[PDB]
Swiss-Prot record:
Reported impact of residue 234 to R: In ADMIO1; uncertain significance
Phenotype for residue 521 to R: Decreased acetylation by EP300/p300, leading to impaired homodimerization and activation
Effect on the protein upon substituting residue 239 to R: In ADMIO1; results in increased transcriptional activation
Positions bearing N6-acetyllysine: 437, 451, 467, 521
Organism: Homo sapiens
Gene responsible for this protein: STAT3
Protein name listed in UniProt: Signal transducer and activator of transcription 3
Amino acid sequence: VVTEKQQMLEQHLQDVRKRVQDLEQKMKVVENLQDDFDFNYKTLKNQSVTRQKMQQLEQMLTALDQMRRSIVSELAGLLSAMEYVQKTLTDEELADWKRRQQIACIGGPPNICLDRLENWITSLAESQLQTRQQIKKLEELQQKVSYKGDPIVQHRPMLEERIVELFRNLMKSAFVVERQPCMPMHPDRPLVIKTGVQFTTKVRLLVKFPELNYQLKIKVCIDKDRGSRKFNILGTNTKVMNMEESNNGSLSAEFKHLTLREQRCLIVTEELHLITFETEVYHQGLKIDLETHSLPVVVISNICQMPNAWASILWYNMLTNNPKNVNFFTKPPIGTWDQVAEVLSWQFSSTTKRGLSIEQLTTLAEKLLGPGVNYSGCQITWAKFCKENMAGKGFSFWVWLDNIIDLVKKYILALWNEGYIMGFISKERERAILSTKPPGTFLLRFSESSKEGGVTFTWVEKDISGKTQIQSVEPYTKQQLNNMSFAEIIMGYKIMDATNILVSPLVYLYPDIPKEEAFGKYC
Ligand SMILES: CC(=O)N1CC[C@H]2CC[C@@H](C(=O)N[C@@H](CCC(N)=O)C(=O)NC(c3ccccc3)c3ccccc3)N2C(=O)[C@@H](NC(=O)c2cc3cc(C(F)(F)P(=O)(O)O)ccc3[nH]2)C1
């Protein structure tokens, strides 16, 4: 859906194009008048005929001055308009995309489409090129015909400085990282790169100029620049930018043959690195030095470091919009619960068909902050999330959660995707909602004491005394889920009753779904 700010920008660019086109027509008229003045001056060098020709030349030069004074001020007004629209385009519309990319990287909505910004940037770039050519024409015209108090000699140096500044800054802003450094075997985990592993990245120039096809050589490097590890990019670290049908005519450069190796003559998962891209543009007498960099990258040595490395990327991209804060973990910022809850639900909605529900997020809030009702005014630190182990446990909240995400993705995906997994429910709440329900009613949830991840089912029944009993089964491990599906385990589960007969204590899946109707399709 196109916004009000974006529709106003589309008209503001169209108005710039109309102004540029209107000045082109004035430039033609001023050139033809000067060419006539130049011709008539150089030629015919009663006696009244010479006097009449002299009056013609004076009138033509006075008219030349007025047309020049008009064009110069019309160009000054055009540049001011260009400056405003460029600030809206680069500092506002482009920055929003950069933030939308940070969010998409960490599982957020996958918007981040360049086609509209490429169309707007190209339009502004083409308009600025015609303006630069009009300022070049004023220089050419002045050289041939000038006079004391000529508006070209006094205002052209400022007009030239203004358009050159505009065009350089637009070219520099258009050089973006379309696809952030990522390992192809871990597409759901970008900005985490293991040494010796082939990784890919992609860059794009949003100024759609066909002149530049096969002209820009993109050089890629790491650690360009206290006590931090230094690395080198090995493989094919140079790529010629080209227009493809696959890109829809867009100028881009994809690096697929890259690897990191430590250079040879703070904790590893919190150390950040920047992958830099460089090129030089030579366009009609201008040398524009383009330089862009990736979002901070965590460099790992073993794949066991992947969970803590991903948490550092989650923290960085959730809390800051700054694209180069390498010292972020020297003093990491605090997050709100609503910020964290959004990211945690993104971890599930990017890997599965279902994110985290309100009830699942509430029980997750209580696990980190303790009892309460409203968690919107609560704060979560890096220590409570990843750096330090949970209160009374030998593992951090993130390690416990990452093992659940993996359990869902690899072992119980189909059940999670259909909504048969209660997942996160406190011992007090599960006993509460089951207390009212008939005997044999059960819910599926994850283990809180299991580091590696465990799945369980909590059920309700009545003893001979009539007292309601709520029990959970010993959590089923990943190893067990590799032999039997959780659905087969639910159906096959038997208990020894009072009559000493093996019976299934499971009848209905919460709230009232008969077990065979919900889990039969998976056996
Ligand atoms: C007390 C009771 O009424 N129960 C029945 C009896 C006991 C004893 C046997 C055990 C059981 O049913 N085991 C399962 C296998 C479970 C597994 N993880 O592999 C089972 O099917 N047992 C069979 C059997 C038969 C042959 C060979 C092996 C096992 C069985 C069947 C019939 C009779 C006996 C045994 N069986 C149980 O799990 C009983 N419950 C527990 O022991 C238990 C629940 C629980 C919950 C958590 C948590 F919520 F996730 P957290 O957030 O981490 O705190 C953590 C630890 C936990 N332990 C349920």
